[model samples]
Target chain A: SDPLAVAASIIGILHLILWILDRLFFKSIYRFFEHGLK
Target chain B: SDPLAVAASIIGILHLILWILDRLFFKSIYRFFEHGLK
Candidate 1:
């Protein structure tokens, strides 16, 4: 878990999945954007 | 006996999940982008 390469890879994959979901479902993505804005 | 324990456990699980994600992605994933960062 502490390995830098391993950690970075994990995060990248998760973000890619999230990006796909955001594109697939805009409302939920907007909610996250709004929440971050606030 | 401590709610903090439960909260910490939840947080730990989330970190573990993110850690897994970091391993998969291998890219720049924001490190301090969680509730605890605030």
Candidate 2:
């Protein structure tokens, strides 16, 4: 059937989620570290 | 024999590569900008 395609779609969505989280959450934390230094 | 497995492997590897590129390339540029402004 389309099981492999479905699996690939799941992974692609996870990667897309990673990108969004990195942009939305990670960058904020990353910048906080930068500014934390003084 | 295992075409679905093969395809899944390919897509998995690609997502991993995407993670690496984002961590190395995108984060680097983002930091450069964050540091540039002030």
Candidate 3:
């Protein structure tokens, strides 16, 4: 119920989202290169 | 630099950035949730 706690939870969720994006972005780029090579 | 090296470097950079953000933000948030839940 605390504002700071809510903010922290939002940031925590965002942090995880960014990590997932990073992983997916890297994988997509790598796959692009793989297709180019094939 | 070699293309592979470039890819490696980029991944390292991205990984480190994520780690830094995690350290700077996540620990405190985790502590808050821990305290709130417990």
Which candidate comes out best when scored by DockQ? 2
Record all residue pairs in model 2 with backbone atoms less than 3 Å apart, i.e. clashing. none
Which CAPRI quality tier does the interface of model 2 achieve?
Answer: incorrect
Shift of residue A36 alpha carbon in model 1, Å: 9.5
Model 2 TM-score (2 dp) = 0.44
Candidate lDDT (C-alpha), each: 0.54, 0.66, 0.56
Residue B16's lDDT within candidate 2 is 73
Q: lDDT for model 3, please.
A: 0.56
Question: What is the TM-score of each candidate's chain B when compared with the real chain B?
Answer: 0.46, 0.50, 0.48
The sequence of per-residue lDDT tens digits that candidate 3 reaches over residues A2-25 is 334454455566768876785587
Expressed as tens digits, the lDDT of each residue in B1-38 for candidate 3 is 35654555555556666675643453444554557798
- Candidate 1 Cα errors over 4 Å, as ranges: A29-38, B1-38
At residue B30, candidate 2 shows an lDDT of: 57
lDDT by residue (A1-38, candidate 1, tens digit) is 23444545655576578667765775875564455545
lDDT string, candidate 2, A1-38, tens digits: 55667667777787788767766874665664454443
Tell how far residue B31 is off in model 1, in angstroms.
24
Model 3 Cα interface RMS deviation (Å): 20.5
